[PDB]
Amino acid sequence: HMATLKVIGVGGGGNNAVNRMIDHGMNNVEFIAINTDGQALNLSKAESKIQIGEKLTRGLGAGANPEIGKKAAEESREQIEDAIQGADMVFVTSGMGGGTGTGAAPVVAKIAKEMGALTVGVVTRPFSFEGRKRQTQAAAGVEAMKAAVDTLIVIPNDRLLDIVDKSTPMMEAFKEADNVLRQGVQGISDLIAVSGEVNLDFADVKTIMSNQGSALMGIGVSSGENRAVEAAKKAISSPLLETSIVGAQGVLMNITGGESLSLFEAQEAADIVQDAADEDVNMIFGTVINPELQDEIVVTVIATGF
Numbered sequence: 015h016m017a018t019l020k021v022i023g024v025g026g027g028g029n030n031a032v033n034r035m036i037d038h039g040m041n042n043v044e045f046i047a048i049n050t051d052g053q054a055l056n057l058s059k060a061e062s063k064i065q066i067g068e069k070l071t072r073g074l075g076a077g078a079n080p081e082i083g084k085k086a087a088e089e090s091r092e093q094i095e096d097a098i099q100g101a102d103m104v105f106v107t108s109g110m111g112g113g114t115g116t117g118a119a120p121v122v123a124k125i126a127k128e129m130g131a132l133t134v135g136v137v138t139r140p141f142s143f144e145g146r147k148r149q150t151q152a153a154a155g156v157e158a159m160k161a162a163v164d165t166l167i168v169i170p171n172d173r174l175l176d177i178v179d180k181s182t183p184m185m186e187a188f189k190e191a192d193n194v195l196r197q198g199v200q201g202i203s204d205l206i207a208v209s210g211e212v213n214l215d216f217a218d219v220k221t222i223m224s225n226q227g228s229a230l231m232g233i234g235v236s237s238g239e240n241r242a243v244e245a246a247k248k249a250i251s252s253p254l255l256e257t258s259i260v261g262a263q264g265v266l267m268n269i270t271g272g273e274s275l276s277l278f279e280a281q282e283a284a285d286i287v288q289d290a291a292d293e294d295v296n297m298i299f300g301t302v303i304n305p306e307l308q309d310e311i312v313v314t315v316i317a318t319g320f
């Protein structure tokens with residue numbers, strides 16, 4: 015039996031991320047759009063849509079009030095439960111600092127976690143230009159999210175200002191933030207579908223991610239001379255995430271390479287991840303030999319327990 019994967023967008027930012035993943039097309043993944051705002055939800059491409067808090071907001075947004083988001087989700091608990099039914103893994107994605115995301119996303123997470131699903135949060139923190147109130151609501155939102163999920167990935171939107179030039183379109187910057195969740199979902203789909211030479215399965219994902227807190231995640235791609243060290247360095251250097259690898263107690267790591275993937279290379283990449291941790295780790299290590307690949311290597315890393 016294959017693990018059932020569901021991705022849930024909660025509020026404006028959450029649903030923007032989901033709409034872009036639906037645009038790409040993820041085949042074995044179920045998408046769920048959750049919002050207070052009915053106009054926005056009507057335009058979603060998601061095949062499962064839940065309008066929350068109709069009695070409370072009359073089909074409008076939460077107007078940046080997290081109490082309205084939270085009570086909206088509590089009003090609609092049974093419809094959330096129904097949409098999540100059957101999930102083995104749930105990704106909850108949302109922008110913190112607004113009303114719907116901040117308030118409803120932790121309610122959604124708690125529902126997913128009590129249904130037995132491995133519950134991963136992927137959230138943003140507001141830009142400093144949005145101001146102190148917005149940042150404060152977001153901090154409370156992150157804390158509520160941390161209590162409700164198995165593992166949380168936090169992307170401060172301020173980090174987008176470190177990866178743009180003065181002309182990079184705003185939408186193109188948002189796509190980079192979006193890639194964290196998209197490549198994460200794809201990585202798990204791959205892990206579940208493909209039998210590895212050193213095989214990792216969904217029980218290995220649960221061991222590393224179940225009942226943790228903050229997580230670092232990344233992917234590194236390289237080829238040529240120093241490909242193993244370069245790939246591993248890129249996977250653990252995640253400029254968009256709040257959490258760094260230092261102090262990690264649990265690591266899931268996979269290397270995908272062609273027939274030339276050397277044992278020496280595998281140790282080099284794994285030593286980069288071990289060393290950067292700076293701890294006595296529980297590493298679960300996997301490898302895939304894809305005979306389609308020539309000189310390209312792909313290292314993927316999830317690091318938890320700080």
Ligand SMILES: NC(=O)c1c(F)ccc(OCc2nc(-c3ccc(C(F)(F)F)cc3)c(Br)o2)c1F
Binds near residue numbers: 214215302
């Ligand atoms: N070695 C394998 O059995 C294997 C395979 F055949 C294909 C892909 C694969 O892993 C891809 C991968 N995906 C992840 C991963 C882990 C966590 C997350 C998160 F955090 F849920 F987003 C997302 C992706 C990792 Br670490 O590695 C394998 F381990």
Ligand SMILES: Nc1nc2c(ncn2[C@@H]2O[C@H](COP(=O)(O)OP(=O)(O)O)[C@@H](O)[C@H]2O)c(=O)[nH]1
Binds near residue numbers: 115
């Ligand atoms: N990275 C990113 N952040 C967003 C996006 N849309 C909104 N945000 C952020 O998420 C916060 C909450 O906005 P929104 O999710 O639209 O409000 P909600 O609908 O009440 O949850 C905003 O303060 C922005 O910082 C997006 O598309 N990408």
Ligand SMILES: [Ca+2]
Binds near residue numbers: 204213214
């Ligand atoms: Ca596998």
